[PDB]
Enzyme design. Structure first.
Site, PDB file in Angstrom:
ATOM      1  N   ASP A 191     -49.846  19.568 148.912  1.00  0.00           N
ATOM      2  CA  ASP A 191     -49.004  20.188 147.914  1.00  0.00           C
ATOM      3  C   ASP A 191     -48.360  20.404 148.337  1.00  0.00           C
ATOM      4  O   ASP A 191     -48.240  21.609 148.583  1.00  0.00           O
ATOM      5  CB  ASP A 191     -50.439  21.516 146.769  1.00  0.00           C
ATOM      6  CG  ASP A 191     -49.720  21.325 144.960  1.00  0.00           C
ATOM      7  OD1 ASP A 191     -48.944  20.873 145.257  1.00  0.00           O
ATOM      8  OD2 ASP A 191     -50.797  21.572 145.123  1.00  0.00           O
ATOM      9  N   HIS A 213     -50.725  17.548 144.026  1.00  0.00           N
ATOM     10  CA  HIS A 213     -51.069  18.026 143.428  1.00  0.00           C
ATOM     11  C   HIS A 213     -51.576  17.621 142.050  1.00  0.00           C
ATOM     12  O   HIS A 213     -52.303  18.519 141.109  1.00  0.00           O
ATOM     13  CB  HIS A 213     -49.608  18.667 142.395  1.00  0.00           C
ATOM     14  CG  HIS A 213     -49.569  20.263 141.821  1.00  0.00           C
ATOM     15  ND1 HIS A 213     -50.452  21.275 141.838  1.00  0.00           N
ATOM     16  CD2 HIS A 213     -49.720  20.637 140.139  1.00  0.00           C
ATOM     17  CE1 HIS A 213     -50.673  22.226 141.137  1.00  0.00           C
ATOM     18  NE2 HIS A 213     -50.286  21.754 139.503  1.00  0.00           N
TER      19      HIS A 213
HETATM   20  N1  LIG Z   1     -43.594  22.117 137.408  1.00  0.00           N
HETATM   21  C1  LIG Z   1     -43.470  22.497 136.402  1.00  0.00           C
HETATM   22  C2  LIG Z   1     -42.739  22.106 135.061  1.00  0.00           C
HETATM   23  N2  LIG Z   1     -44.052  20.798 135.034  1.00  0.00           N
HETATM   24  S1  LIG Z   1     -43.645  19.946 133.994  1.00  0.00           S
HETATM   25  O1  LIG Z   1     -42.172  18.904 135.040  1.00  0.00           O
HETATM   26  O2  LIG Z   1     -44.487  18.537 133.649  1.00  0.00           O
HETATM   27  N3  LIG Z   1     -42.474  20.840 132.603  1.00  0.00           N
HETATM   28  C3  LIG Z   1     -43.491  20.668 131.317  1.00  0.00           C
HETATM   29  C4  LIG Z   1     -43.149  20.007 130.893  1.00  0.00           C
HETATM   30  C5  LIG Z   1     -43.712  19.415 129.674  1.00  0.00           C
HETATM   31  C6  LIG Z   1     -43.525  18.786 128.686  1.00  0.00           C
HETATM   32  C7  LIG Z   1     -42.650  18.278 128.983  1.00  0.00           C
HETATM   33  S2  LIG Z   1     -42.412  17.063 127.097  1.00  0.00           S
HETATM   34  N4  LIG Z   1     -42.543  17.785 125.742  1.00  0.00           N
HETATM   35  O3  LIG Z   1     -41.052  16.442 127.278  1.00  0.00           O
HETATM   36  O4  LIG Z   1     -43.080  15.647 127.233  1.00  0.00           O
HETATM   37  C8  LIG Z   1     -41.739  18.606 129.779  1.00  0.00           C
HETATM   38  C9  LIG Z   1     -41.904  19.013 130.913  1.00  0.00           C
HETATM   39  C10 LIG Z   1     -44.674  22.331 135.685  1.00  0.00           C
HETATM   40  C11 LIG Z   1     -45.799  23.285 136.621  1.00  0.00           C
HETATM   41  C12 LIG Z   1     -46.032  24.429 135.826  1.00  0.00           C
HETATM   42  C13 LIG Z   1     -47.110  25.675 136.906  1.00  0.00           C
HETATM   43  F1  LIG Z   1     -47.289  27.109 137.090  1.00  0.00           F
HETATM   44  C14 LIG Z   1     -47.529  25.237 138.319  1.00  0.00           C
HETATM   45  F2  LIG Z   1     -47.759  26.140 139.274  1.00  0.00           F
HETATM   46  C15 LIG Z   1     -46.780  23.452 138.228  1.00  0.00           C
HETATM   47  C16 LIG Z   1     -46.292  23.139 137.942  1.00  0.00           C
HETATM   48  F3  LIG Z   1     -45.785  21.361 138.280  1.00  0.00           F
END
Ligand SMILES: N[C@@H](CNS(=O)(=O)NCc1ccc(S(N)(=O)=O)cc1)Cc1cc(F)c(F)cc1F
Lengths: 724, 724
Positions: free
Chosen positions: A668, A700
Site C-alpha cells: 500500500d 490500498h
Molecule cells: N487520498 C484521499 C483523497 N482521496 S480522493 O483522491 O478520492 N479525494 C476524495 C474525493 C472524493 C470525491 C471527489 S468527487 N466529488 O470529485 O467525485 C473528489 C475527491 C482519500 C484518503 C483519505 C484517507 F484518510 C486515507 F487514509 C486514504 C485516502 F486515499
C-alpha cells in the site's frame, strides 16, 4: 432465495451501465458485444462505426481505445499496467480510419505514461520517460518538447504521487488549448521529497524482495515544487529544441510553499490558473493572456481573484473549476456564500466582486454545462435532501428562472442524477443511480423532451423479484440545532418489533457522504439480506454538501467530532426499537478504518467488535496535501498538539474491551503498512489481543480478484462469530 | 493449583542456575546478589573478589564484565545493543584491580563490535568499525592492525551475517595463541553478496520507516569470500602499520567456492585450520607451523587430513574441532566411523590414518577435556538412550579402560549432564538438566570424589509439591528395522483409559532432537497441566545422535521424510488408547513451522489445526550455508528439482482441510518475512481462509517481553478454540 456472499463476490446480479462518448453536438459512440457504433440523437438512426472483428488479428488484447476528434484515427491502448490510483503505462498503436491501416512509421513507444489527442483534429501529446513529445500527424516523427525528465525526480506533463492522488486526480499534467494551438503543462520537482520505502514480494520465483521507493511527502515534510509552461504546437521545426513559455506564479504565493491547483482554458489565447498556499486557507486565480507581439503570457494583477476561508480550508477538496462564457470575459464558479453554503458566483474578469446566481440552505454540486442561453448545474436542493442529486437549468438572462429538469421524472425510483452533455449542449444523457434501479435516458436541451430509454435494467429487475432483497431507509435525526442524516439497510421483511444486530458502516472523512439515495449491491446487501444485520451509515460533523457550518466543524481537530458523532449515532439507533444493543459492530476502510479504530479505543463500551481496513493511525504518517489541508503543519507553533492527541496508538489500552480485526495490504503506497504496524505494536505493548491479516502485495484497494474475495470472506466469518 | 499461562509468562517458578568461570586450575568466580566472589575448590574457602557497591557510582548499568586472566583488570560491558543472534555493540571501561581506578586515557571507543583479553595476562584485542585494534596495556594507545574495514563489506576479525549464524556461532572471528603471542584472525568480503532489504518501523515518533540492508546469500547466490591472517602482538612499533602474515588455503579448496570452517591453536606456534568446500561433502584440515627465520607460516601437505562423506554432508553442522596433546603432534577429533556413528579418532600429524578409540551403536557428543592421563567426553551410550548425556573418562594408555563418572550418581533424577572443567582439568562441575530438577555439583578429577552440592533446586521443589505438575514419558517406537524415539508431556493424573487432545510439537531439522531427558518449564507444561493436552515430540529420520543411517536419510530431500515421519508419529499415538483422534494439532517454529506447514499441506487429514511460527516456505529463500549443506545448489544440473518440489506454496490447496495460524516477525533477518508473505499469498490465490499475525519489528525470536507474552497468549486461544 437470498442475496448471499457469493452473489456479491461472483457478481451474480449485474447492474447495467450505458457508456457513451459525445463526438459532436448530436452524436455519440456506443460499444456493443464487441462493436463500436454511433447513435444519432436527432434521428435515432445508428451505423456501425467499427466492427468487432477488425482486430481479431491484431495480436494484442486491447485495454482501451481513443478516437481522434476529427474521426481520422483511433488510438489503441494495450499492454496496460497499473501504477497508482490513476497512473499507468501502456503500449499504443494508431489505426487509420480513413484508410484501413496500422501506422508502422514513427510509432508511440512502449512504456508510455500518458497520451492525448488535441481537442480538435488529431494532434498527439504523449509523456514518455517523464518527457513530453508531440506528433501533429500520426506517421511523422515527434517533437520532443522536454529534456529535463528524470525518474522519481522531474515530472513533465505528468503528476507525481502526491499531485496525482490529492490534487488533480489524474496522471496527466498537461492541457490543450480549445482549438489545439497550445499545450499548457506543469512541471514537478521531487528533488528533496523523502522516499517511502516498502517491500514487494512478486512471484514465488523472485528470490530477493524488491524495495519500492516513492517520493512521498508525509505531513509537514519537504513538498514537491512546481513550474508551469505553455508551448506553441504549430511553430515546431524538425531542427529546433522547441520553446516553452514559463508562466510563473503570483508573488503572494511565491513567499512560501505553494501548489498549482487548477488549470482551465478560457478562450483560444486566455488560460486561467489557480494557486494554493501550503496552508490551504488562501487561494488565488490568475488570468493569463497572450501577448502576440512578444510570444509571452501576461497575468494582469487586475484580473486576479482571491479565494479564502476563515472557518477552514478553501474548496471541498480544492478550489472549484471555473466555467467561462464563449468570449471569455466573465466566468461562473462555485464558492461559499456568507452563510457558508456552496453556490454559483458570476464574475467579471476585472471586477473583484462577484454576484451569487443561486441561494438557499443547500449546495450546488457542480456546473455541468454553459451555453449562451443557460447554465446547467447539479444540486441537492429538491426536498431539502442532501443525499439527492438533481439537474436544474437557470436562465442566464433571468436568475429567478430556475426549472428542475429531473426532479419530477420518476420521484419514487430516481433521486440521484448525473448528466452527460453533447458539444455545446444540444443533447443530454441522464443517469439515475437510485434509490430505485439505475435508469439511463436521452434528452434534447432545446425543449427538454425525453427522447428515449437507453437502459431500464429490466433484465436485473426480473432476477430481483426472485430474491429476498433488503430495503433502504434514509432519514435524519436532530442532535443540536441541526439535522444530521443517516441511512440504514434493513433486512428483508423488517419487523420493527424485533431486536437486530447492527453494523455501523464508517467513512466520516472531511466532506464525506455515507448517507445518500444511491442503489448499491455490495457486502452490506448480503449482511442484511442473509444475516439479518442492520448496516447503518451516518453523516456527522465534517460531512459535506450541508454547508461549511458542518463541514468545517472538523477543522484542525481530526479524529475528534466525526469520531464522537459516530458513537452518538449508535446510541440513537439503540433508542429506536429494533437494535440488539449487545451486538453492535463498526467497520471502515481508509479514513473509516481510522475512525473505526478511534471509536474502538474511546472506551464508550457501545460496540462489541470492529474491523479496520488500511487505517490511518497517526496523521503525521499520511501525505501533506491531505493531512495539512485539514490539520495544518505538525509543529508546536502551528498544530502539533492536535496531531499528537489524535492517534490510535494513544488509545491502545481500551481495545481490551473490544474485539478488533486489523487488515492491511503490504504494498500500500497510499496508507502505508507502517500505519497498521504501529497500531499492532501499541496493542501488543499494553497486552491487548486482537486479530490481524496482511495481504501480500495488495495496495490500498486490496482489489485483486483473489484478495477482494478472501478479505470479504474473512470479514464475514469475523462479523458472524462476533454476532454469533 | 495448576501451572497456568501466567505461571509461564510471568516466570513464577524459577529454575536455578550455577554459573561459574574458572580462573585457575582450582579456582572459579561466582556472582552473588550483586557481588563477585571466588571459591576455592580445594579448601572450600571463598573471599569477596569484588564488592556489590563498587559501581553504585559508576553511572551506567553494567550489562556484562570480563576479568583479565592475570586478575589485573576487569572489563565492564555496558550500553549493550543486540544486533543478530550473537552479535552486538557496546561501550567499554577498564577498572584497575591492582589499584582502584577507572582508566581514563586511551579508552575503548563507543560502538565496539567485539573485545577480548589474551588467554594469558591482559592484552586486549578489540574490533571497532570492522577494523582490528590491539592494546598490550589498558592505559596506552592501541595498534590498529587493520585498515581495510568497511561497513557491510569488509569484515576484519568479526563474522558477517552468514558466517555468524551458520558457521562459527559467534560474532568474533579472531583467535589468540595460547600464551597470547599471536592474534590469528579471519577476513570476510561481502562485496558481491546480495542484500536482503526490509522495513523497520521504530517508535511511533519515526515518520519514515527505515529500510534495513544486510549482505545475505540466499541459496545458490554469491557467497562471501574469506582470507586468513596471523599477526605478532609483540613486534608492534607505535610507528609501523603492523604486519599480518596471510595464511592462504589449500589448492583442493581454491578451485571453487569455500568456507573457513574452524580454527584451533595446537601449540604456541602451531595452528590448525579447517576448510570446507561450498558443496559441503568434502573437508580438509591444514596444520600450519611457524618458520622462525622467515616469519611465515608453513602448511605441510604431509600434515593435511581429508574429511568427507558419501551418505551426505561433513559434520553434524560443521566438522568437529580437534583436541591436541600438550606437545601438539597428535590430536583427537570426532568423526563418522565405517558404520556411520560419531566417535573419537586418534590422529598423528603426519599419518593420514587415524585410530578409533571409542566404538558402539551410540555417538560421542563432544570432547570436553584432554590431559596427559585422560580424555573426557560426553556420549549417549548409557542405556542405549539417545536423549541422555553422560560424562565418561577413557584411559589414554588403555582404550579399554572407560568409566562413566556420572551415570550412577542419581539414575532417577539425572540423565542429562553437561560439564565445566578447571584449567588442566583438576576439577569439574557437573550440570544435570533432567529428567528431575536441575542439580549442580562440584568434583575433583584426581579421585572422582563428589566435593559438594552447588545447587539442588530445593527452593523450587518446595513450590512444585503445591502444584499439579504434568509428567514426561520418554519411549521409542519401531518403524522399520529401526527404533525412533518420542516423548510426551502427560497431563497431571494421566488416565490412559481416557481420550486426550494431542499437540504435536515439531522441529524435525537435520540433526534435531526434540525427544530427550531434559527438565523444562515452558508452554507445553501449561498445555498439559491446565488444558489436559498431550504435547508430544518425535525424532524421525534426519534427527541426530543416532548415526548417519538416520541423520543423512534427509540428505538432498528436505521437506520429505522428516515431514512424513511426523505424520506417521501421529498415527501411532492414535494407535495407543489415550488420544482423541478428532483433536490432533501440530505446531512449530523456524524449521518446525516449515514442517508444521508441509504437514498441514499433505492432505493426510490427521490434524484439525496447526500453527507455523516464522516458517521457511521455500528453500531458495533461506541462506546458502544451511540450505546447501542439505540440498546442494538449486540448479537443474545439481538439485533444482527437490528445491521446487519441497515448497509450502505447492500445497496451498490442502489447507482447505485445516485451520492455520501463520505468525511472522516483520524485522526477521534470519527467516525473512518474505517466506510467510509468499505463503499467505498462495493460500489467498486458491481461496483457503486462515489466520495471520505479524509482529512489528520482532526478529526471529519474537523474544521481546511484550511480544513473547502476546504471541504465546494468542496461540493459546487458537489451540483452545481449535480443541474447544
Ligand atoms: N487520498 C484521499 C483523497 N482521496 S480522493 O483522491 O478520492 N479525494 C476524495 C474525493 C472524493 C470525491 C471527489 S468527487 N466529488 O470529485 O467525485 C473528489 C475527491 C482519500 C484518503 C483519505 C484517507 F484518510 C486515507 F487514509 C486514504 C485516502 F486515499
Amino acid at each position: 432465495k437470498t442475496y448471499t456472499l457469493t452473489d456479491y463476490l461472483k457478481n451474480t446480479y449485474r447492474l447495467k451501465l450505458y457508456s457513451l462518448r459525445w463526438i459532436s453536438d448530436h452524436e455519440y459512440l456506443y460499444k456493443q458485444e464487441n462493436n463500436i457504433l454511433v447513435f444519432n440523437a436527432e434521428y435515432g438512426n445508428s451505423s456501425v462505426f467499427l466492427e468487432n472483428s477488425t482486430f481479431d488479428e491484431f495480436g494484442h488484447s486491447i485495454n482501451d481505445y481513443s478516437i481522434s476528434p476529427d474521426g481520422q484515427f483511433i488510438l489503441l491502448e494495450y499492454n496496460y499496467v497499473k501504477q497508482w490510483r490513476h497512473s499507468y503505462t501502456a503500449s499504443y498503436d494508431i489505426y487509420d480510419l480513413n484508410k484501413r491501416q496500422l501506422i508502422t512509421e514513427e510509432r508511440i513507444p512502449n512504456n508510455t505514461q500518458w497520451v492525448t489527442w488535441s481537442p480538435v483534429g488529431h494532434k498527439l501529446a504523449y509523456v514518455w520517460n517523464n518527457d513530453i513529445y508531440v506528433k501533429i500527424e500520426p506517421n511523422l516523427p515527434s517533437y520532443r518538447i522536454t529534456w529535463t525528465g528524470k525518474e522519481d525526480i522531474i515530472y513533465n506533463g505528468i503528476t507525481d504521487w502526491v499531485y496525482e492522488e490529492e490534487v488533480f486526480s489524474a496522471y496527466s499534467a498537461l492541457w490543450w488549448s480549445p482549438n489545439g494551438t497550445f499545450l499548457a503543462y506543469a512541471q514537478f520537482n521531487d528533488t528533496e521529497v523523502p522516499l517511502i520505502e516498502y517491500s514487494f514480494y512478486s512471484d514465488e520465483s523472485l528470490q530477493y524482495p524488491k524495495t519500492v521507493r516513492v517520493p512521498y511527502p508525509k505531513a509537514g515534510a519537504v513538498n514537491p515544487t512546481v513550474k508551469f509552461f505553455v508551448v506553441n504546437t504549430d511553430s515546431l521545426s524538425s531542427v529546433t529544441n522547441a520553446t516553452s513559455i514559463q508562466i510563473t506564479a503570483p508573488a503572494s504565493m511565491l513567499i512560501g510553499d505553494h501548489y498549482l491547483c487548477d488549470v482551465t482554458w478560457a478562450t483560444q489565447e486566455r488560460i486561467s490558473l489557480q494557486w494554493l498556499r501550503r496552508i490551504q486557507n488562501y487561494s488565488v486565480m490568475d488570468i493569463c493572456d497572450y501577448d502576440e507581439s512578444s510570444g509571452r503570457w501576461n497575468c494582469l494583477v487586475a484580473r486576479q481573484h482571491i479565494e479564502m476561508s476563515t472557518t477552514g480550508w478553501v474548496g471541498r477538496f480544492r478550489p472549484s473549476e471555473p466555467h467561462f462564457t464563449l468570449d471569455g470575459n466573465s466566468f461562473y464558479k462555485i464558492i461559499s456564500n456568507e452563510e457558508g453554503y456552496r453556490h454559483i458566483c458570476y464574475f467579471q474578469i476585472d471586477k473583484k466582486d462577484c454576484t451569487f446566481i443561486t441561494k438557499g440552505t443547500w449546495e450546488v454540486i457542480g456546473i455541468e454545462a454553459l451555453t449562451s442561453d443557460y447554465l446547467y448545474y447539479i444540486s441537492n436542493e429538491y426536498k431539502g435532501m442532501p443525499g439527492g442529486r438533481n439537474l436544474y437549468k437557470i436562465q442566464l438572462s433571468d436568475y429567478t428562472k430556475v426549472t428542475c429538469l429531473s426532479c419530477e421524472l420518476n420521484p419514487e425510483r430516481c433521486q440521484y442524477y448525473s448528466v452527460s452533455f453533447s458539444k455545446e449542449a444540444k443533447y443530454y444523457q441522464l443517469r439515475c443511480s437510485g434509490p430505485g434501479l439505475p435508469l439511463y435516458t436521452l434528452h434534447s436541451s432545446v425543449n427538454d423532451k425525453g427522447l428515449r430509454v437507453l437502459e431500464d435494467n429490466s433484465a436485473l429487475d426480473k432476477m430481483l423479484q426472485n430474491v429476498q432483497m433488503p430495503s433502504k431507509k434514509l432519514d435524519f435525526i436532530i442532535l443540536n440545532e441541526t439535522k444530521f442524516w443517516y441511512q440504514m439497510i434493513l433486512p428483508p421483511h423488517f419487523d420493527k418489533s424485533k431486536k437486530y444486530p447492527l453494523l455501523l458502516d464508517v467513512y466520516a472523512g472531511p466532506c464525506s457522504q455515507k448517507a445518500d439515495t444511491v442503489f448499491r449491491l455490495n457486502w452490506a446487501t448480503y449482511l442484511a439480506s442473509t444475516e439479518n444485520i442492520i448496516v447503518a451509515s451516518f453523516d456527522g460533523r465534517g460531512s459535506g454538501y450541508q454547508g461549511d457550518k458542518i463541514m468545517h466543524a472538523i477543522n484542525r481537530r481530526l479524529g475528534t467530532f466525526e469520531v464522537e458523532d459516530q458513537i452518538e449515532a449508535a446510541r440513537q439507533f439503540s433508542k429506536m426499537g429494533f437494535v440488539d444493543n449487545k451486538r453492535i459492530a463498526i467497520w471502515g476502510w481508509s479514513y473509516g478504518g481510522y475512525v473505526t479504530s478511534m471509536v474502538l479505543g474511546s472506551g464508550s463500551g457501545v460496540f462489541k467488535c470492529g474491523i479496520a481496513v488500511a487505517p490511518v493511525s497517526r496523521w503525521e504518517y499520511y501525505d501533506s496535501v491531505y493531512t495539512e489541508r485539514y490539520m495544518g503543519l505538525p509543529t508546536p507553533e502551528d498544530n502539533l498538539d492536535h496531531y499528537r492527541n489524535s492517534t490510535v496508538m494513544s488509545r491502545a489500552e481500551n481495545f481490551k474491551q473490544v474485539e478488533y480485526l486489523l487488515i492491511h495490504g503490504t504494498a500500500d503506497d497510499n496508507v502505508h503498512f507502517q500505519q497498521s504496524a504501529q497500531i499492532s505494536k501499541a496493542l501488543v505493548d499494553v497486552g491487548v489481543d486482537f486479530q490481524a491479516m496482511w495481504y501480500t502485495d495488495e495496495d490500498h484497494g486490496i482489489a485483486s480478484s483473489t484478495a477482494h474475495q478472501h478479505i470479504y470472506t474473512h470479514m464475514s466469518h469475523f462479523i458472524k462469530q462476533c454476532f454469533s
